[PDB]
Design a protein around this ligand. Sequence first.
Ligand SMILES: *[C@@H]1O[C@H](CO)[C@@H](O)[C@H](O)[C@H]1NC(C)=O
Ligand SMILES: *[C@@H]1O[C@H](CO)[C@@H](O)[C@H](O)[C@H]1NC(C)=O
Lengths: 439, 439
Amino acid sequence: YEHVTVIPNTVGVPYKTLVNRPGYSPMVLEMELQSVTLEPTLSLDYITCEYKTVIPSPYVKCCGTAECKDKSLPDYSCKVFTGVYPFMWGGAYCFCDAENTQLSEAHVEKSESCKTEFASAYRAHTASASAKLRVLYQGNNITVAAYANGDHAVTVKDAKFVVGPMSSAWTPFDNKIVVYKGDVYNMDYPPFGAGRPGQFGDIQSRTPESKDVYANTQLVLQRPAAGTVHVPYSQAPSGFKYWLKERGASLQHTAPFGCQIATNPVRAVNCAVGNIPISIDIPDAAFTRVVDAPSVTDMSCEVPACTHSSDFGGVAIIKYTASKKGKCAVHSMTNAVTIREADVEVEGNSQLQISFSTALASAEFRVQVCSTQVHCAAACHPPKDHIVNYPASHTTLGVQDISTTAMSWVQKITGGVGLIVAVAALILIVVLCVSFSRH
Amino acid sequence: YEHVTVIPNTVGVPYKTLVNRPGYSPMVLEMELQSVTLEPTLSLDYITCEYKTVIPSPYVKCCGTAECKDKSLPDYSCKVFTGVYPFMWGGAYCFCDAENTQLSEAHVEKSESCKTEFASAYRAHTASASAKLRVLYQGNNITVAAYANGDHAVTVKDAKFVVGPMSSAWTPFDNKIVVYKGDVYNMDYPPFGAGRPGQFGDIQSRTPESKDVYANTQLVLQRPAAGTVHVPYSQAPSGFKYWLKERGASLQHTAPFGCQIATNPVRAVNCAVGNIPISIDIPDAAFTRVVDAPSVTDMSCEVPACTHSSDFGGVAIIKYTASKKGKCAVHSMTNAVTIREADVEVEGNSQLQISFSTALASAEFRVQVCSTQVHCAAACHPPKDHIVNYPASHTTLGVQDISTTAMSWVQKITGGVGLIVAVAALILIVVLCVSFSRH
Ligand SMILES: *[C@@H]1O[C@H](CO)[C@@H](O)[C@H](O)[C@H]1NC(C)=O
Ligand SMILES: *[C@@H]1O[C@H](CO)[C@@H](O)[C@H](O)[C@H]1NC(C)=O
């Protein structure tokens, strides 16, 4: 047998789905979402890290002049100066008072630290869904894992489960993302080869190991301090290290629906959006012919007390009589109320208690068991607490709601005098019809 | 200086782009598309290959009966039979004439050949673009490679090139694709775990090395032939090997726009769709002040003959006079005609010849050189050939076209008698206005 259902995309909220098959006892299964993972694409746009500035020993000269020869290196720069008269510990370096010259040059390279610490920019666009389910089958909890895209089919305990596809294509991610060691950020990185100094992307590297790099750091030299031998540099401050200082809030806090985000691999998990379709092919072995199930008769219901709450605040006692000892499923056919229990053993002329959750001020509903219906009417009361920690979406109430006793009040209010006014209009128009024929 | 242009997405067709800068001699660059590669996503849905059927030695028994014990193996099957009296070379296996029994069983596993030969199904959805360009710069052809998505920037010979993004998002691929050793097919494979026997996907494996597999082969046993010892099997024929027999046309022939398809990695290349935007930042070093360029004067044009064709069938001779020896660019400002040459050396009061392509029956156009314009009028003739092999899109002609001498004819035809009829109407209405005042 094949059964298809749909459930809200929520985690930790048990769901009852009643599959019925003529000629056999109908059975209701409990399905729970352990977690749902969304794996986005991974197109590594590039990486970046802190840079090291290499400035070899400056070239000094006397009574002669140096010269700049271009170097095919990133952001390589050079300069010359004249008239410098450096002094060392033992005295002047050389005699030429002003005929001397100084040549300096520098460049910037990647740091070995990049091999361990860095920030990587990807252009992830799409994603795939995988999920974990817990199912109450034959009186035991069973775990299943499958891709929640409507394609993956999984066989367990002789039954075939298919999940997905996700109703909503929404994702918390973005086309372009930047990832640190364990943090993710939605942020539009500058295009490769156009890094703006002092900002993210100031140095661009294709891979942590690729020797080729790109840089933009305005490396300008300056005239050295008089009387000293040294190289000054106007090295641009590293925007990469700085961006780590102003990273801002991570996406695990800014993600709508709070989809928890992990790494290695990067996934977004546990966000409630849309719903999921599930198709279950269940072999008939689990199915039991109706004759096998014990009968039921003399059904009475009572509610000693009930309390509409996020928990199972409602308790109902039912008196039942059955043919023989045996298991029997229990369900509520009204979505406004949910029942924690799935089935129960029935011996005969006995009673039982059931714990349920509702949201109506007055709970008036039918309950199905052993292919029989029993009414239940009660007046719940508001609990004391206004907010709770654990989640509970079972007790969902639409705009339609039970006015309870006040229902009668509005039923009494609905009475109007339109009938009498129409009667008066008819009477006047007829008594006029003596003179009013067809106008 | 920054210049932005757009060119049709075509390969092998040179394109002239004239960048002009006041205060310097304008320069026209030739850009050609070597190839454009589209790399689609790669999400390996699964793989498949031929399967091997393992049927160990059947269990024989006499005067007793065997039994089937379930095996947690793919498509494992078993059966028993009674009354079989097998015979071997030396005589009957055993005495029990009919009390004997036979137990048989079999299963199906992956083949070691899968490690070498197989077919892999992917769910590639999106793609990225990379391209190769040839540019005529400073009188030399230079090659550039970059991602054609409007992001990658490439520095060459002191100039910054940016290409893309692709105007059209169209692709020849599809969300779901199946790849053989060197062939690709657009084909919707069945979902994993639901392989239909005798068709592609009949056996499903997550990876070539993963031990776990899924199968669907209706392995039913049969009663062995009387008087013999052997195992019959109703093994399902392998749909995988068969699909190789009816693969059909590959996508390299069915792809619109003929985008050539490769593998390892899978790319679609050389398909003309849409256009490409290109932004070039050119340092002023290449730019030359107008005063540097020699002047030009006494410009005359003549066409000894021309022939509108896919080739450079037009030849034009120009008499020119210049101030001094020097290079000078040449261009045509009308898109209806293209010129093969980019620049030329000019010595002074001399002449030159230029080879060009057109599509107008009568070619009437201006030509720009050394910031000066020269007219050129000629009457081309149709060539003899009706179809050619090499591609040529330069000579593009819109609905607007030169009627040539016949233009005058229609200009003569345009004359109408509406003027005289309006004159007659005015005359009659006025001579009536004696009695017609304002109606
Ligand atoms: C299934 O999970 C519930 C959750 O609390 C647990 O109480 C129960 O013992 C588990 N096993 C069953 C229902 O067989
Ligand atoms: C550039 O390519 C053309 C193509 O044929 C070739 O003729 C020419 O020699 C190449 N080099 C140039 C134009 O410097």
